[PDB]
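Example complex used in Figure S2.
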Amino acid sequence: MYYGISQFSEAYNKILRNSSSHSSCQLVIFVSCLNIDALCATKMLSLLFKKQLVQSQIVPIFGYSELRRHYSQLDDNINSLLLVGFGGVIDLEAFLEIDPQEYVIDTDSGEQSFRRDIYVLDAHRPWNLDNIFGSQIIQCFDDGTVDDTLGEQKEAYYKLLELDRKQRKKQIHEYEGVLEEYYSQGTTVVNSISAQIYSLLSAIGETNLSNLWLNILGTTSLDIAYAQVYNRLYPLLQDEVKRLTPSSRNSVKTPDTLTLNIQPDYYLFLLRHSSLYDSFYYSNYVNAKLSLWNENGKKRLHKMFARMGIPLSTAQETWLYMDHSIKRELGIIFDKNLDRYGLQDIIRDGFVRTLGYRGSISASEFVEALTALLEVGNNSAQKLTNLRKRWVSNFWLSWDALDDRKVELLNRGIQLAQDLQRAIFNTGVAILEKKLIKHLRIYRLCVLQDGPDLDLYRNPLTLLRLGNWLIECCAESEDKQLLPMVLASIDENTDTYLVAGLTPRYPRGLDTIHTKKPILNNFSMAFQQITAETDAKVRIDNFESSIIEIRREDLSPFLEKLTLSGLL
Amino acid sequence: NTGKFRYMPFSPAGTPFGFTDRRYLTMNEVGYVSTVKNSEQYSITVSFFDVGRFREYHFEDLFGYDLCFLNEKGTLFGQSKTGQIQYRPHDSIHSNWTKIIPLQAGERITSVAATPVRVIVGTSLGYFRSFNQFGVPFAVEKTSPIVALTAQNYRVFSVHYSQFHGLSYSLSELGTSSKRYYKRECPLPMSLPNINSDMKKDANLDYYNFNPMGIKSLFFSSYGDPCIFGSDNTLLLLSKWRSPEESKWLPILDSNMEIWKMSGGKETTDIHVWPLALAYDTLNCILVKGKHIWPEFPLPLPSEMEIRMPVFVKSKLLEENKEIQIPVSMAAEEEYLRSKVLSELLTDTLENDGEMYGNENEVLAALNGAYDKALLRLFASACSDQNVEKALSLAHELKQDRALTAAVKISERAELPSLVKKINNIREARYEQ
Amino acid sequence: FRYMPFSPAGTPFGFTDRRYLTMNEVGYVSTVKNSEQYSITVSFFDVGRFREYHFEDLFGYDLCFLNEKGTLFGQSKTGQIQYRPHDSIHSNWTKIIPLQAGERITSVAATPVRVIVGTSLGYFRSFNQFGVPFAVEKTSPIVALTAQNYRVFSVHYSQFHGLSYSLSELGTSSKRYYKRECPLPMSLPNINSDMKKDANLDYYNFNPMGIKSLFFSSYGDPCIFGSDNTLLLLSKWRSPEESKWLPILDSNMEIWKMSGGKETTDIHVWPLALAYDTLNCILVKGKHIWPEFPLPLPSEMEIRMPVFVKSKLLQIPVSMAAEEEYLRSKVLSELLTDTLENDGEMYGNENEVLAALNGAYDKALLRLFASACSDQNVEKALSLAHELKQDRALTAAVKISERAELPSLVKKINNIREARY
Amino acid sequence: TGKFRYMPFSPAGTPFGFTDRRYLTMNEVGYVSTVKNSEQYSITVSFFDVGRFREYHFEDLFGYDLCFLNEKGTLFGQSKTGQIQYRPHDSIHSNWTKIIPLQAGERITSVAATPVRVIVGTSLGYFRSFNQFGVPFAVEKTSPIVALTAQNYRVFSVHYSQFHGLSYSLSELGTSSKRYYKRECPLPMSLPNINKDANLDYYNFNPMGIKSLFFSSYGDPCIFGSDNTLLLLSKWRSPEESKWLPILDSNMEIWKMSGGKETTDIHVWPLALAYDTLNCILVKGKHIWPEFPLPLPSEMEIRMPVFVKSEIQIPVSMAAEEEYLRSKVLSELLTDTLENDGEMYGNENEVLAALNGAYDKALLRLFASACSDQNVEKALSLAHELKQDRALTAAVKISERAELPSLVKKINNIREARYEQ
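Predicted assembly (1843 residues):
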């Protein structure tokens, strides 16, 4: 372990001592864009440092190349660096060309001090042992995994470090085997950065309703792909909401009251900001459980609505103007008429925040709006950089959406979320009708070669959204065995693909012994190994490890070698 | 054998649960502690007023603590039944510890206290068990049943109540290396709620259930003067507390009277005073407006009230029956009394406790100037009645000689030629004194 | 538990409008109800220097306390205070005491230096002779209060702390304290408080505490008298730790024995004052314990230690009467001495009266020595002779020793005489 | 509210019971019991000491109700018809009979005899004292006295009342020197109100269930009651530093005696305490009082309530803590008799040295426990009380082993501060 849960306050105090000078701005926060959890964590840090008047700079970085370029550009005065959402799975001192002898001051006296401190803050579990164990400059905000599940790796790393006959060589190979089996592991996510920073705030005592709301947003960002993590962290948020809500309950509503509530939040898509029919129709879970992509699915949906006794005219009405008779009986109606179709998991408990008279909104809807703003908010090596520039710019739109004074931007985000879900649904029914997903014995490939609005999928977030749609659809099919999926999308302007190796997941709400063990995404190591040999102009720079940009002509040989690769 | 026999736990400025999950364990001068149930157990939250020296924190709680006590160096938690106490210093250099108190049949911890020299735990039976900062026991003693506790930096003040001995207080200064005692089981003049507890009260029954004796707080002063607040809504200070023979219980504030005289004329009952601390006429107290005596989770701003003697007579105050007018004849006399008591209190800490802020001498000099100004006004008022003996008697308490010269001028101007010679004789006597 | 106004030596309404408020060695106050109000009548027992005067009242003061230079008046509720000095050189004044909701004034007292009024709640407000306030204090709830020339005495009762006496010497500028909030040993009437009594129900309802007088001795020694008919005193008032409580006089057995030693229950005595065992008191026979009728001559009854036993008395035996005289002289010896080294020689007879008291003390020792000689006890005589003070008394003890048929009796007293050298 | 039943009480009081076998008073020297021969009472006075205190019996016709034992006599008395029987064991001092003045409502509650004075209390609140010959010497009035036990020169006068509550008072009467230490201060003894077979009889015998009022081997006052605790005065000489430390807990201790379960037939009747040696009678049966003639009181060490509910294994971590607290509390008690009472038992210095050695041994065990706990601050606090410098060397030796460089240097810093002190 490097920084446990109980000693986050030590890191915060170290940051304050090193860089809380009003003379200059010696603190720089590197945030990974295209990550809602990192966005909420950086918003928390921004508010916390605004309270203590610690001058700081927030830089959205898209890829590892940008991180390296910025660090090279980074001045030596800046003596505190925060990496939010990345950096925990690579040799940062090696990647950034860091040698501790050039950053050490006042070596003496069993202590050491350095002129610059890098605090990595992410949730991807393959901690690089040369970062968590063998470097003092790099300081990792651990969540308790290393101090409990890395004892063997700690011993193996230290023995090899200190040792630089037959028994000695045999034991070295035995220890080196322990390190090797630690690697060759898929990259998962166990915690949410927002929850970690909220734990730090609880240690410092700066918790309030806005920070709790940011924590809820960051945690709810994990419910789509890491539902086990969200279910693990949910009781803590539930306790915090009860702790922070004022005792003056059942009071009259006033234009100033902000209420965090735990009320039934059905697992539909933008239920409060769109019609009930559109909430069922465009839901990922409902689509998986009913197969609405085919023609018979719409008939099933209409039959369900008739069964509940909700007229289609009322069902398609906007949620605000739905008749108060139906809107107040949603719980009873869903209890009576959902287990018939297997949608019992739709009913759920979530967090809903109302700001005075501005109407309710749930964290699930809020994160969809934020994601939409990230995705569509606003010869070959140059236009791609223009895309990176636009993608960085969208981070600030999603950042400004968090402010309560910019609801006119959150509504635009909601509209963009509805449009993007519509486009995702159209492309999904186009893929599943033409049977574009080629089943294999290693990975179910799927390449998007032509169609409409194909420029949406050059963004990694939109491609992951489509992949999550497909994976949710496949997960509820019993015949289809679990298998990694690959999505690609040709970028005509740059003549390059965007391969996004995904991971399968068990059906939502299905809790078993094998469900408890998380599924690990093995595509990162496979991609890196394939790129190391057989130079193919592959661009592996995303913080999301399992996403690469490959030339149009080099895609097929790359996939051939990947098929020959048994790593994944 | 009931009602007052219930030694239900009490902590300074406590609060009942009432009709919600929020409860205030303690409101010291340095912060407050609140508890909320997470539908199965409590989560403690400790906040501090002097943000800049401490940092608030909240932790999960499983034992369901009922007692708390905040110092400038650490806070102590207690339990009513099976009273496992917990002490946690604010700084991380000192490690917090927990201990289990010896519990007997019918026993229940009533109050807890802590001091940088020793930590003291109460007991319904009347035990006086004490430990060091780190939990090692030091001595076990039995006294009258302790019902409340409040400690300053080095001194501990407790009130003992029993159905046979009555309300008896005891102010003991443990000291760094000398356990110098100042009082022991001495009778106290606090009025226990008896008539008001005879099934005639609205919304006060729940609070009286929370605290049977109705004593709201036992906060000290900035100079170590013990103070008492309860149902009678009057502060009780110990003026000459250094000498046990010089024990003095002076009612320094009258909450109901002050509230009435600032409310415009109505005898309002919807205003309740929750004192926190007093520091040289600065009484910090939350003024809750409503039918609920205890405050809510958003603790209101600690509005400050000034000390006022209960010399205000209703007969004199209803001269303008309905900015309540004050009789100028009695207002100056009350200012005289306030200046007198404040000067006496400051002199005790001047030579003994030394300088505290570097301005005690100057404020004492200004207070003495006001003290003699009040004497001059009373002298003029007596001269207005053509009572030369009254003015002569009042002139013997003058401190500054310049005020005595002003008294000479008053005598020579207020149609009293005979007073001139006597005040001049007093001044000439003061020449050699 | 109920609190109602009361003054030292206070009398209840009874059946006549003429009600007396306070008895003093220099005066007394009687109130007459003229169908609308109580007219204050003040009359002095002293020489013509203290001139009797009467006036008309409208406020109806229910409290009174006389002194050597003025008398204070007040009421329980809305208790305006009017301390009118006896001398006409000091003009009187009127002022209104602060009061709370339901608060009542229980007792009043006056001092040459200050004036102090008690409250039911327990306030100890102190003023001056001209009405200007000086200090306000709080103690246990007061039921009665008495003030001397330089010191004051108050008794505090509450439903929890109960009876407790407070001794304070405010003085001109010296606040000498000796006993604060200390419990008092006076036994509250329990059998007498029962709802079955003859000619006493009115007083018990008016004064549930049962205390009748709270005056002082000549030397400022507090005296306590109540329905228990026991005269309490502060033996060692100078030392709070060494302070005692000796019943100087028991009214009941004294009035039982003076007439003929037979049974009697109508010789109730109202105490007036005390000055070196000159316990002047009202001797009224009948069903009017309080002086409802005009007070008779305050005839004196000297104190007597409660050593008398009913079995040995049911005339006085001469062998043990001198023992009681010995005990009285012994207990009064320190009482007479204290004035000499504390209050000075003010009466002027302290030296001669103390010499006479010590002479009688050693004479009683000699008489008990002869009695023990008749008992043929060497140890008793030796123990009694240990306390001999006068050398001539010791020589008389030696002379008795050689006569009372005892050889060992002589040698011990001779050794004691040698020790005197 | 009419609770005024102040029945007479004596140390180690015993109810009559179904039979006539009732103990008047039981002391360490001997026990006094009673039996009725259908017409009168027979008083059996025995002695547990050496044959010098020979057992003697006398026929009683007055029906004595109270008794008191002494090294030079024994007193007897009865509740009604106040009479006195201080009949000394030695024939050199002639026995005398004195008549106690009895009044209506008045009843004798307690008696106390000393070699220099004999004192009897009453429910009225009197402190009558008589000389060795029974002649009265000084009568004092206090709060209603219900218990009165005295040492050779010290008396622990306890006064109780409905309007005054419990109130202890310890005073020095002496042969001719009157000194006072504690007067009228309340005591924390617990009135039994929750509490029945064989219990209601004893409650009718005594209201507050006091068992005994014996003193220590060095004259330290002690009180034992229904709560089954011993109340000792560490700084009895100092009034402002008075301490009431619990010493033993019979109810708590009796749990682990039988089997660690709830037992009700192994009741304890303590007699006296002398340096951690308390002799107690292990009465077995439904009746609390010993119906049979009193057997030898089994010795038992003192244990203040440090144990917790959560032959029986005792935690060594808390066992040595309890021994530490015992040594600490007994250290000042042993030093009390040094400068004032001196050496009389010939072992005070040796027992003091052994107690100090055990005190520092418990200190060392606590230091080892804290070192195991790895608490630097706890060890630093524990190192501030080491008495013997050799124990300090042992602490240094432990410090160099308990894996703490700072521990070694801080213990050596304290030791070097002790080097030049």
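The interface with chain C takes residues 166-167, 186-187, 189, 191-192, 194, 232, 236, 245-251, 309-316, 333, 337, 340, 378, 382, 387, 389-390, 393-394 of chain B (CB under 8 Å). Chain B has two domains: 5-311, 312-433.
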